[PDB]
Each structure stands twice: as C-alpha cells, then as structure tokens.
Symmetry: C4
Subunit: 99 residues, 4 copies
C-alpha cells in the first residue's frame, strides 16, 4: 500500500513497507497509529510541527538515518522524535551526533 | 473540531482546541477571525505571508513557542505577529530571542 | 475575484486586485499573462523556480517591495525578477539595497 | 505535454520537454523513469526526500544549475543527485561549490 500522513494540512505519502520497517514506532505500529487515523479522509492526522516531518519521514526512507534539518531547532526536533516514538536507541545515536 | 486556514493558497489544518490555547488572538477569537471565514470552502483565507505561517500555527501547537523561520526577515515576521495579534508576551519573547 | 498561480505544481492563491496594482508586469498585464493561462484548470502555469515565487508574490501583496529571500541565490532571483517583468525601478531599488 | 512527479505526496508539475533537456538522466530517459510510473494516477511516484526535489527539477528548468537547498544536508542531497543520475559532470561541478 501507500499511506497518507497529514501534518497540519501538509500531506505526505509513503509506501506502507517504508513505515513497516520500524514496527515499534508510532507510525510503524498499526495499534499506535490507529489513534491518529481519520476514516473520513483515509489518512493519518497530526496537529504538529511541519518542518520536522521531512526528517522524521527520511528516517524511515533511509532505513535509519535521523538528521535534524539546520532550520529546525534542536529542542523542537527532539520533542518530535519522542512524540513519534522512534525509540531511545535511535535518540541515542542522534544525541551524540548533535550535542 | 477541525479548522482549515488558507494562507495565499498554502493550506494549514488544525483543531479548534489548538487555537483555543490563545483565545484573545485573531485566530483564537471567533469575533476577530470571522471576517476571514468562507462557508463555501469551509476555511479561513488570508492573503498574507506564506513562509511565516507555520511558525505562527506552531506557536499554538507548542503552547507558546514562537520562533521566526530563518528565511523570513525580522520585519516581515514582526508584521505577521502583529496582524495575528499574538499578544505582548509573545511579542516580548520574540524580541528577547532576536536581540 | 480570486486567481490561482501554479509554479511547477505549487499553487499560490491571491486576489485579482492584488495583481492589478502593477499592470505593466507579466502577471498584472492581461495580454502578457494570457500566454501562461490554462483555461481548462482556470489557473496560470509557470514551469519555473519555486522558492523565488514567494518574493514575487510579496512584491504584489506588499504594494511594490522587492526583496530577495536569503535562501534564494542572487543570480537565480535576478533571472526571476526579469522574467516576471517587475520593472527597472523595482530592480534598481532591489539592486541598490543588495548592491 | 505536461507531467506530474509526486515526491512523497508533494506534487511537482513540469513539461516533458523540460525533462528532455537531459535525456541521459533517470527522469529524462523513458527506459529508466517508467519503473516509477503510477498507471492508475497518471503520475510518477518517488518515496524520497521532498526538499531536495525542487532543486533537482530546477536543474532541468534552468538548463543545468544544480544547487543544494540550504535546508538539505550535503550527504542527503549528494545521494539524491546520484539517484536521479544527473551525471559525473554535474556531480564534479557540484563538489566544487561546497568545497
């Protein structure tokens, strides 16, 4: 499949297999992402920061590369990582690499 | 409840409860935002600055974090904060973080 | 009246009256913008640089201020201002500030 | 003829003749880009980085200007140049500007 993820009006579309790669995360776990599903529009909706999501999606697309865009402040971006439940392992790697 | 905010063609979506974080602002007060509403398309339309708005919306979503996008000059973002009536406190946090 | 401008897929919406302020420009002149009109979709289409268009739109929305976004290189932006035919004074005022 | 390129839900639109300015690349070659075509939607689909793609399409539109968007890191953008197969000539030149 493909899946549509709507971040505060900005629509993203990715393969189902892209998200299924990390099944423990919010987006990869069918039980966690269902809380954000909108059956009326067949999409997931998040009322959240928009610039961060390119990098959150690239984490999946790249198979594990977590990079903060230069224009997204570290505090904001770290809050999004935790929200999307990328995991402490992932955060670990990211931490060092940043500060 | 969901609300759509169209900034010069750029679509934003959020919840009524998110705008309710700051009820005395333009978007938070029904009386102030009502002149920009379009019942036909079921959205609010502003013929304004596109690159500024994701940070204005994120201010509500974060419960008060106002950060000027790097690509938007100080005086352009200053006018948008003023127009959206974000308040003296938001205007003081803007000043402090910019100089 | 409302006008839709599609820049390589990125849709901008503005009032016809916003474009009407500068009638010697490409977008303000009915005879110049007709070449890029798509009568099927009821929109103007430009197969051009996307990031520069926020500043083009700002020229109209601001009542004639021409400013270069920090992440758009000057050679690219200068080509875009020429193409949209914003004018000599516009460019000269732009030139000066820049240099 | 017009063509729609959907990069992770972000729809870019251009002309066939624009892609044909570099026939040896992925998007310029029918034999390479058809693997990403979506029969049902009449568009190409890439489950790839969004902010990189405006610069990739602009490379075609401009006739060879390849510039990394400030917000996209060097390694991520480099990977995109390779994927879209812009060529060794184009990559060499791109290496010079960053260093």
């Amino acid at each position: 499949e493909r899946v549509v993820i709507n971040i505060s009006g900005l629509r993203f579309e990715t393969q189902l297999k892209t998200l299924a790669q990390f099944p423990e995360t919010l987006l990869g776990d069918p039980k966690k992402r269902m809380r954000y599903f909108d059956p009326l529009r067949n999409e997931y909706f998040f009322d959240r920061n928009r610039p961060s999501f390119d990098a959150i999606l690239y984490y999946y697309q790249s198979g594990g590369r977590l990079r903060r865009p230069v224009n997204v402040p570290l505090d904001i971006f770290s809050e999004e990582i935790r929200f999307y439940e990328l995991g402490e392992e992932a955060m670990e790697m990211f931490r060092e690499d940043e500060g």
